Ligand binder design. Structure first.
Ligand SMILES: CCCCCCCCCCCCCCCCCC(=O)OC[C@H](COP(=O)([O-])OCC(O)COP(=O)([O-])OC[C@@H](COC(=O)CCCCCCCCCCCCCCCCC)OC(=O)CCCCCCCCCCCCCCCCC)OC(=O)CCCCCCCCCCCCCCCCC
Ligand SMILES: CCCCCCCC/C=C/CCCCCCCCC(=O)O[C@H](COC(=O)CCCCCCC/C=C/CCCCCCCC)CO[C@@H]1O[C@H](CO)[C@H](O)[C@H](O[C@@H]2O[C@H](CO)[C@@H](O)[C@H](O)[C@H]2O)[C@H]1O
Ligand code: BCL
Ligand code: BCL
Ligand code: BCL
Ligand code: BCL
Ligand SMILES: CC[C@H]1c2cc3[nH]c4c(c3C)C(=O)[C@H](C(=O)OC)c4c3nc(cc4[nH]c(cc(n2)[C@@H]1C)c(C(C)=O)c4C)[C@@H](C)[C@@H]3CCC(=O)OC/C=C(\C)CCC[C@H](C)CCC[C@H](C)CCCC(C)C
Ligand SMILES: COC1=C(OC)C(=O)C(C/C=C(\C)CC/C=C(\C)CC/C=C(\C)CC/C=C(\C)CC/C=C(\C)CC/C=C(\C)CC/C=C(\C)CC/C=C(\C)CC/C=C(\C)CCC=C(C)C)=C(C)C1=O
Ligand SMILES: COC(C)(C)C/C=C/C(C)=C/C=C/C(C)=C/C=C/C(C)=C\C=C\C=C(C)\C=C\C=C(/C)CC/C=C(\C)CCC=C(C)C
Ligand SMILES: [Cl-]
Ligand SMILES: [Fe+3]
Lengths: 238, 302, 281
């Protein structure tokens, strides 16, 4: 009967959908590799999808995936076992080397642009009209690390112009230089800004940006990776 | 305690954003409404501008007419008494025409005629709004995903008050406009067709409804977990993968054996939700037209 | 066995128990102490399901069904064949769910990300425990819990609902359905929005989040934003399940009559309680 026909054909439809969906989700990270970086023998039952190309706005070119995957950076790690499946230990300083929870990806060294072609993120001092409209203003507050020591003071807020949102706090260090701290990793209090992921002595290590009025996607990743990595590596001080 | 990023700690405001232009007729956009500090703790504080074209005004007018038509009847049943209106608000109901009138528009106002009038406005309000979601995307050069996903919800709606009633032969098979009454209608519909739990499309539909909650819980939680690496900027992560996208993928790969991509997860999302009403409409359409009793059908499968 | 960018993330550390003892992967799967734990609880649980299958006399998946102890047994133990297996399996299920959540916490620590995922999962655990543990204990017997069977558990839903008339009238049940419905609506929109921007009309350039906000303001006069909509999806989902657990925890405990009658408090309010006319007068 019709009902039986409808339900059987639905399961066939659903099977094609799962197939489509799974291959679509293989546009990044594939093919699989062995721990040494060579192509793994078994890639699974699903084949790689045919390449698709994105036309990036503002003349930034195109992106085609799947495509040549490459870390484009040295990885300071070494095996801990003679077989597959075990952790790889940091050969140097995991924070400085950018491995583990402190990893960063080699994204384009350009800033993200808004719908009009302007830098999406700008320090507030350079953003006409922007002001703190609610909640405690962090500008001027001392910054404390997980070791309960003061590492600096907030001198500005970097904001997302098109989304009117605070993304980073610019902090001035003892030596007069500044660093950016992800808004999501700080706790703004009445008389201070608390940073649980880093100890005062690690702030100097936060990657610096090359221009004082803009951050590139590459710098954002290095900064955020570094700060998140403190949760595990700074622990011996927190 | 570390920051969870569920509520913003500091709000920042700048000049009202008039939005992108593309091929949008800027003449039809209203002015920017006020800013809400309340909403600003959770999402954007800006209210407006809204775009009101011909189709928009058409839909909004039909919408109110549908709404008011029901309201008139509710007042009529309350003997125009304000106290009664509030007391029995949930019990009032604009029922469809009796079976006798079948699929005709001859039924008297006090017996389904008014129901037909209201249904007419709703039909116009909804479809014109559909065209609106399609045109608003075209004016901005965006894909038509929202309009197609909306069509799926429209499907179940069309089937419940239009398609099935036509195939059954009378408007009496449609849903009445009433808070408690449409609930009673739902319970009855099940009892009358055997038990809906035996309808395979109903079970699939529940699957996707439950799955939508599971997936959004998963997705929302994931993005917030990697917002410390700018994970919510999903479009740029699609164009130039960051550590937020890699960590998000690896969390799920290490947990359940497989994962998605920043773009892929949204394809899973759009379908999981769309299938809820897609399979649902099929299950309801087949009830009473092809299958009288799902229990019986389940015993044979034909 | 590894995604192209995976190696740099597979470092030691993050475990909550056993130091480096179980700190390794099996294929794409991370193990950890809790990986071992859920395997244990799951295997044991499946074994007891099979045993229950023989005692019933069927290996048909659509027929297998492990029932809880009959009401007469109250909140005490029962013979395996009569509710005991159900009690042990429930212990195993709970053990597997909690272990799975703690395993996610370890995966979060190694990756340096937030704990929002396992946190959200705990809400599902909670709904389950409400049905097989909290409500039953409050009612006095494991017998009120639901049976583990594909179709039998639907019968339970059906019988339990009708025990109070049309369950549609449970007010907390109404709130819950609203969140479920709204969540699906929101998930469809979020999915459609991001895709329509990443995949614009053929030949055109990728749209920006600016077009995403503009699109919704044009449509309904408001846009919650990219961060806000992920916050919203998390909230609609957790709320749907929170109110679900709530509508059942009050049923059969503080309220055990027909749910439709509960609405009489509103209609019998002194003021309009007698004004003739309307539906209730
Ligand atoms: C009876 C049922 C009647 C019910 C009516 C309700 C209809 C519900 C519609 C739901 C639409 C949701 C789709 C989401 C989506 O992708 O939308 C965008 C998509 C592209 O939008 P765009 O703006 O034009 O393009 C933007 C970019 O250029 C391009 O952007 P893009 O890359 O994002 O889009 C490409 C997209 C293109 O989208 C499609 O091609 C859509 C496919 C339509 C599916 C309709 C479902 C029918 C239900 C069948 C169930 C059976 C029950 C009996 O690709 C897919 O999504 C792939 C679909 C996977 C199909 C799998 C088929 C398996 C067949 C089995 C094979 C055997 C297996 C071997 C074992 O829209 C459509 O393609 C429109 C579909 C409308 C159909 C209306 C039917 C008329 C009545
Ligand atoms: C690098 C390499 C990566 C390589 C390969 C990766 C493999 C990817 C596999 C992706 C699968 C996947 O997403 O599958 C799904 C369905 O699962 C199950 O049926 C059942 C339960 C079983 C779970 C199986 C999980 C797989 C774990 C994979 C390990 C692979 C790694 C080894 C190396 C998931 O989610 C499904 O999404 C569909 C939506 O279009 C469909 O609806 C399906 O539906 C169920 O139909 C039931 C019928 O009774 C119904 O009652 C239920 O309500 C439905 O939800 C849903 O479960
Ligand atoms: C929530 C209120 C009721 C309830 C009401 C209903 C109703 C009503 C329906 C279901 C349906 C289903 N329910 Mg239920 N269900 C309840 C509690 C549970 C519990 C539990 C541990 O408490 C489990 C595992 C299930 C599982 C299931 C699935 C077998 C089936 C739904 C698929 C789905 O998409 O789910 C959403 C989840 C996903 C999409 C994610 C993927 C998960 C997969 C699908 C799980 C497969 C489990 C497998 C069949 C069982 C394995 C057990 C073995 C011992 C290992 N229910 C409670 C008691 N359930 C539907 C059906 O068709 O039933 C026949 C249906 O109509
Ligand atoms: C006692 C009654 C029966 C029963 C009878 C039915 C019946 C009858 C139907 C369902 C349907 C559904 N049931 Mg049931 N169901 C039962 C028990 C359950 C249980 C359970 C745990 O026991 C569960 C989880 C479900 C779950 C579900 C859903 C999967 C599904 C509806 C999807 C949806 O999003 O609809 C909501 C979405 C819509 C209606 C979409 C259309 C919306 C339109 C386009 C919008 C109009 C807007 C208006 C103009 C504007 C308003 C805004 C203004 C600002 C005010 N049922 C019992 C056993 N169920 C439906 C289905 O699809 O079934 C196959 C259906 O018809
Ligand atoms: C799916 C099966 C049944 C059905 C079963 C139920 C059940 C069961 C419940 C509701 C409930 C509601 N239903 Mg219904 N409902 C149906 C069809 C419809 C249609 C339609 C145009 O077809 C509309 C507008 C509604 C509208 C509504 C809301 C008034 C109310 C849910 C709040 C909510 O979160 O809304 C989502 C929309 C927004 C947030 C935007 C505005 N239903 C079909 C016929 N509906 C709930 C309630 O509280 O009722 C009193 C409830 O428990
Ligand atoms: C005819 C019967 C009554 C009725 C009786 C009931 C009863 C009785 C109950 C509900 C419940 C619910 N009803 Mg009802 N309901 C009716 C009609 C409706 C209608 C409708 C449109 O008519 C709707 C939308 C609903 C909707 C709902 C939901 C709000 C809610 C279930 C979701 C939930 O709790 O998830 C919660 C999720 C879970 C419990 C799952 C937990 C998952 C666990 C942690 C993990 C499992 C993992 C698995 C074993 C792993 C497999 C491994 C494989 C590898 C995959 N009902 C009718 C009127 N409804 C239930 C509720 O509120 O429950 C709390 C409930 O008990
Ligand atoms: C996959 C299916 C799911 C889904 C999807 C879905 N819904 C959608 C879409 C999609 C993809 C849209 O694009 C569309 C939308 O635009 O959303 C923002 C929509 C939509 N889903 C809606 C509702 C809805 N969806 C539901 C469900 C679902 N939608 C499913 C779960 C339900 C349920 C659960 O029953 C409901 C009620 C609408 C809000 C909206 C489409 C709007 C519409 O059709 O409007 C016509 C216009 C009117 C009826 C206007 C009158 C409104 C009021 C009666 C009057 C009071 C307000 C008015 C503003 C007052 C003015 C006063 C004056 C003095 C100024
Ligand atoms: C943007 O970001 C995001 C990602 O990334 C970019 C993501 O990927 C995801 C999530 C990923 C997806 C791929 C979405 C897919 C869709 C779904 C509907 C998923 C849910 C449904 C399922 C059926 C998942 C299957 C579930 C499980 C639990 C499979 C487990 C399998 C086993 C064999 C059990 C293993 C058992 C143990 C004990 C582990 C230890 C192992 C030993 C050997 C010991 C999200 C949400 C996301 O938002
Ligand atoms: C304060 O007082 C005033 C007067 C100002 C306003 C008060 C208004 C009030 C109190 C309104 C209350 C209304 C309520 C509670 C309405 C609830 C509706 C519900 C719960 C559900 C609706 C289900 C309806 C669906 C299934 C309807 C589908 C309808 C169609 C698919 C259209 C079918 C078309 C028909 C019959 C004819 C059109 C003809 C053609 C072909 C063009
Ligand atoms: Cl311009
Ligand atoms: Fe998203």
């Amino acid at each position: 009967d019709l009902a039986s026909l409808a339900i059987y054909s639905f399961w066939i439809f659903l099977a094609g959908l799962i197939y489509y969906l799974q291959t679509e989700n293989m546009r990044e990270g594939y093919p699989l590799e062995n721990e040494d970086g060579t192509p793994a023998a078994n890639q699974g039952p699903f084949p790689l999808p045919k390449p698709k190309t994105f036309i990036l706005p503002h003349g930034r070119g195109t992106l085609t995936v799947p495509g040549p995957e490459s870390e484009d950076r040295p990885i300071a790690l070494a095996r801990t076992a003679v077989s597959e499946g075990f952790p790889h230990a940091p050969t140097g300083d995991p924070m400085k080397d950018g491995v583990g929870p402190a990893s960063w990806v080699a994204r384009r060294d350009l800033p993200e642009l808004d719908g009009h072609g302007h830098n999406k993120i700008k320090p507030m001092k350079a953003a006409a009209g922007f002001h703190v409209s609610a909640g405690k203003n962090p500008i001027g507050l001392p910054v404390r690390g997980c070791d309960l020591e003061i590492a600096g003071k907030v001198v500005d807020i970097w904001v997302d112009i098109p989304e009117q949102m605070a993304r980073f706090l610019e902090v001035e260090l003892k030596d007069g230089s500044t660093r950016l701290l992800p808004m999501q990793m700080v706790k703004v209090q009445s008389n201070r800004v608390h940073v649980n992921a880093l100890s005062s002595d690690l702030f100097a290590g936060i990657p610096t940006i090359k221009s004082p009025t803009e951050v590139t996607l590459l710098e954002e990743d290095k900064i955020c990776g570094y700060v998140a990595g403190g949760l595990m590596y700074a622990a011996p001080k927190r | 305690a570390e920051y969870q990023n569920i509520f913003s700690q500091v709000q920042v405001r700048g000049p009202a954003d008039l939005g992108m232009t593309e091929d949008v007729n800027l003449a039809n956009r209203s002015g920017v409404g006020p800013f809400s500090t309340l909403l600003g703790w959770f999402g954007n504080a800006q209210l407006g501008p809204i775009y009101l074209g011909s189709l928009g005004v058409l839909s909004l007018f039909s919408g109110l007419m549908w709404f008011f038509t029901i309201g008139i009847w509710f007042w009529y049943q309350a003997g125009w008494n304000p106290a009664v209106f509030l007391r029995d608000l949930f019990f009032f109901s604009l029922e469809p025409p009796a079976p006798e009138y079948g699929l005709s528009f001859a039924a008297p106002l006090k017996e389904g005629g008014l129901w037909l009038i209201a249904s007419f406005f709703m039909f116009v309000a909804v479809w014109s709004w559909w065209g609106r979601t399609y045109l608003r995307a075209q004016a901005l050069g965006m894909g038509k995903h929202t309009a197609w996903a909306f069509l799926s919800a429209i499907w179940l709606w069309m089937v419940l008050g239009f398609i099935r009633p036509i195939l059954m032969g009378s408007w009496s098979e449609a849903v009445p406009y009433g808070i408690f009454s449409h609930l009673d209608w739902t319970n009855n519909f099940s009892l009358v067709h055997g038990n809906l739990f035996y309808n395979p499309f109903h079970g699939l539909s529940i699957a996707f409804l439950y799955g939508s909650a599971l997936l959004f819980a998963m997705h929302g939680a994931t993005i917030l977990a990697v917002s410390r690496f700018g994970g919510e900027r999903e479009l740029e992560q699609i164009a130039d993968r960051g550590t937020a996208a890699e960590r998000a993928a690896l969390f799920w790969r290490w947990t359940m054996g497989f994962n998605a991509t920043m773009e892929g997860i949204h394809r899973w999302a759009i379908w999981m939700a769309v299938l809820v009403t897609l399979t649902g409409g099929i299950g309801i359409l087949l009830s009473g037209t092809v299958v009288d009793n799902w229990y019986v059908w389940g015993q044979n499968h034909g | 066995a590894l995604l192209s960018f995976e190696r740099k993330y597979r470092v030691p550390g993050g475990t909550l128990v056993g130091g480096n003892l179980f700190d390794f992967w099996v294929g794409p799967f991370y193990v950890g102490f809790f990986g071992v734990a859920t395997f244990f609880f799951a295997a044991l649980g499946i074994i007891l399901i099979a045993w229950s299958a023989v005692l019933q006399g069927t290996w048909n998946p659509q027929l297998i069904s492990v029932y809880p102890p009959a009401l007469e047994y109250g909140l005490g133990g029962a013979p395996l064949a009569k509710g005991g297996l159900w009690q042990i399996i429930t212990i195993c299920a709970t053990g597997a769910f909690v272990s799975w959540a703690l395993r996610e916490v370890e995966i979060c620590r190694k990756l340096g990300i937030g704990y929002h995922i396992p946190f959200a999962f705990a809400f599902a655990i909670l709904a389950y425990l409400t049905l097989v543990l909290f409500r039953p204990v409050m009612m006095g017997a494991w017998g009120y819990a639901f049976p583990y069977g594909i179709w039998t558990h639907l019968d339970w839903v059906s019988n339990t609902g009708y025990t109070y008339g049309n369950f549609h009238y449970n007010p907390a049940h109404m709130i819950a359905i609203s969140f479920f419905f709204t969540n699906a609506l929101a998930l469809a929109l979020h999915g459609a929005l991001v895709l329509s921007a990443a995949n614009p009309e053929k030949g055109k350039e990728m749209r920006t989040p600016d077009h995403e906000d503009t699109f919704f303001r044009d449509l309904v006069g408001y846009s919650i934003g990219t961060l806000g909509i992920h916050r919203l999806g998390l909230l609609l989902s957790l709320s749907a399940v929170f109110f679900s657990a709530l509508c059942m925890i009050i049923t059969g405990t503080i309220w055990f009559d027909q749910w439709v009658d509960w609405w009489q408090w509103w209609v019998k309010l002194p003021w309009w309680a007698n004004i003739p006319g309307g539906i209730n007068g």
